[PDB]
Amino acid sequence: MIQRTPKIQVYSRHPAENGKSNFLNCYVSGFHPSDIEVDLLKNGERIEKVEHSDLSFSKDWSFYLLYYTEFTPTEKDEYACRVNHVTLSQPKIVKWDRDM
Amino acid sequence: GSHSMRYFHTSVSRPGRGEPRFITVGYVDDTLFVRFDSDAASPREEPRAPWIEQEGPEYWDRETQICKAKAQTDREDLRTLLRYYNQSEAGSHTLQNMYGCDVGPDGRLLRGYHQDAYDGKDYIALNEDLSSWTAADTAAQITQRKWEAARVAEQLRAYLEGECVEWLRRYLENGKETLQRADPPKTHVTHHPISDHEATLRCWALGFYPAEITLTWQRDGEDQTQDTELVETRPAGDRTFQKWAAVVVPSGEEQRYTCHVQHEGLPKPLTLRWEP
Amino acid sequence: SRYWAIRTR
Numbered sequence: 394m395i396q397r398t399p400k401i402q403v404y405s406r407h408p409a410e411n412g413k414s415n416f417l418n419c420y421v422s423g424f425h426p427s428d429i430e431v432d433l434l435k436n437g438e439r440i441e442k443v444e445h446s447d448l449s450f451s452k453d454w455s456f457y458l459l460y461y462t463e464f465t466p467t468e469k470d471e472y473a474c475r476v477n478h479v480t481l482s483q484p485k486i487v488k489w490d491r492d493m
Numbered sequence: 494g495s496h497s498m499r500y501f502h503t504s505v506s507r508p509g510r511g512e513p514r515f516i517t518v519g520y521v522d523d524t525l526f527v528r529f530d531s532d533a534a535s536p537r538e539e540p541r542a543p544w545i546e547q548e549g550p551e552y553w554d555r556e557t558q559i560c561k562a563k564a565q566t567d568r569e570d571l572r573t574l575l576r577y578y579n580q581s582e583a584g585s586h587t588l589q590n591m592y593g594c595d596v597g598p599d600g601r602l603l604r605g606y607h608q609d610a611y612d613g614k615d616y617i618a619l620n621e622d623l624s625s626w627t628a629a630d631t632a633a634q635i636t637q638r639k640w641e642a643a644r645v646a647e648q649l650r651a652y653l654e655g656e657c658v659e660w661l662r663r664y665l666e667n668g669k670e671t672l673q674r675a676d677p678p679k680t681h682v683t684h685h686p687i688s689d690h691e692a693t694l695r696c697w698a699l700g701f702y703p704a705e706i707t708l709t710w711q712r713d714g715e716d717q718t719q720d721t722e723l724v725e726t727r728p729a730g731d732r733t734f735q736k737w738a739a740v741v742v743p744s745g746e747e748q749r750y751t752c753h754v755q756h757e758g759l760p761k762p763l764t765l766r767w768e769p
Numbered sequence: 770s771r772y773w774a775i776r777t778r
Contacts, residue, residue, distance in 0.1 A: 395613045406730045420727045425613040426587055427505055446728075447528045448516045449501050454589055454610045456503075459728050492683065492695075493724075493737075500771055519771075552770070559771045570778040592772060609778075617778075636778040645776055652772045660770040 397455055398480040399424035401487045403473065409466045409491040417464045417489065419474035422457035430477035431460045434486075436470060466491070494757065495603060496522055496672070498661040499593035504567035506586050513571055515564035521664050521672055523703045524732065529560040536561070544668030574611055577632035587612050592649075594657040605653030623650035676702040676733055677758030682767045684747065691741050694767055696752035700733040707755040708738040714751075 399421040406416035417440075419431055427448055433440040446459040464472070472489035502517040515531035518541075526542035538556040540546045567588050575582055592607040608618035615629040617636050624646050628634040640646070665672050678698035685693040696708055704726050710717045717740055726736045742750055747767050754763040 397613070400725060402724060402727050404727070404735070416730055418727070418730055420725075422725055426585065427503065428585070446525075447518050447530060448503055449518050449525075450503065450589060450591075454613050454615075459730065461730050492685065556771060559773055562773075562775050566775055566777055573778055639778070640776065643776060645774075648774050649772065652774075656770055656772075 395425060396480045397423055397425045399429060399476060399478050401474060401476055401485065402493075403487050403489045404493065405466070405489070405491070406461075411467050412465065414463065414465050417462050417472055419460040419476075419487075420457070421460070421476060422451070423453075423455045424457075424478060424480070425455050426479065427456050428479065429456075429458070430484075431458070432475045433460060433462050434473045434475055435464070437473075439475075440464075495595060495597055496661060496665055497593060497595040498657060498664070499591060499606070502563060502567070502590040504564065504571060504588040506571050508583055508585065513564075513568050515560075515567060517560055517563065521661065521668070523734075524668070524672060526664070526668075527556065529557070531564050542668060542671075544664065544671070547667065574632070577635055578611075589613075592653075594653050594661060596658050596661055600658070600662050602654055602658045605650070605657065607649050607653070619646060619649055623653055671732070674702075675756075675758035676700060678706060678754060678756050680752075680754055680763060680765055682752055682765050684767050684769075686744070687741065689744065691743055692747065693739055694742050694747060694750055694752075695737050695739040696754070696765060697735075697737050698754060698756070699735050700729060700731075701735075701756055701758060702733050703757065704734045705757065706734070706736060707753075708736055709753050710738055710740045711751050711753065712740075712742075712746075713749050 400423045402420045404418055417433055419433055421431055433443050440462055443460055443462045450456045474487045475484050477484045498521050500519045504513045504515050506513040517529045518525055519527040524542055526545045527538050528541050529538040538560050571586055571588055589610040594605050595603040597603050605623050609616045617633045618627045620627055626637045628637045678701035680698050683695045687693055698706055698708055710721050720740060722739045724737055726734050729735050752765040
């Protein structure tokens, strides 16, 4: 049984502009099996009403999913993605960097 | 230019938690247009693109029935594969299938596809000749023998050469406003000092479509193929994609680096530099 | 438009 860890990317749909509405995305890809847990976080706390694309896969059969949510970035607020997967010994948390 | 249509399917067993989950999505190039999920309240194939909404009741019913029949067949195959591989019914397993066609600018079939995978590994695939098979192992060979005897390749070939390409052209015409429009990337270069000795130059490509794109950094005109951090092309969520490439440069040598961008939406390849 | 034909592995 093969197991490939998910690659994680947390970013915004548009360039981050404080006080301006946007979309926070957490794209997970290159993973297998498909069972996966992804949570968007605001200052350490889970955001509610996070939508996600339907499971699909790439040429090498590895899966990818897009988790997103509307949000209005500010100077202080901290955003991150928390991912759980059978390949991960513990929940991996990726912080949003308005430059990546 | 060229276009493609693909139908992706995933069946995942979950022993003790009900019947295997089934999820299928359809794409034309990089645009998602249909979806079906066995776990939805009232399972049905749903449109995910404005140009497919016009298809009438018959279309949706047929599609829904197809999806349901596929989900059923995958469930029977997951059980069969347990035998083929001498595995217990206690674990979860995955069955993936992809099929579709590519047509050139003139609307003629360039290539057909139909390949499966079990637990992430190649299982059986229809060859580009649309007449022969490639089994990844002795288990898959059992399937190959059943499909050769039942002449599955002939049926697939007839679909791939006919219906597949026929409907793809129809979708392309109906959604020409979007499927036949390339959105060139908007680009720029950022500079992030890491320390007094070096800095990061990041080349950005945003809001482009389709996903296909090439980003590369050159030092004194030479590709930094081994010293470039390239992230996976990602979806912006509005149909377009994003991607970036970065290099750690010695401070003061920033102007020796150029970022090169290639995308079908650009008349000519772009070359960018950081403006200190 | 999807392929119909039902055939088990």
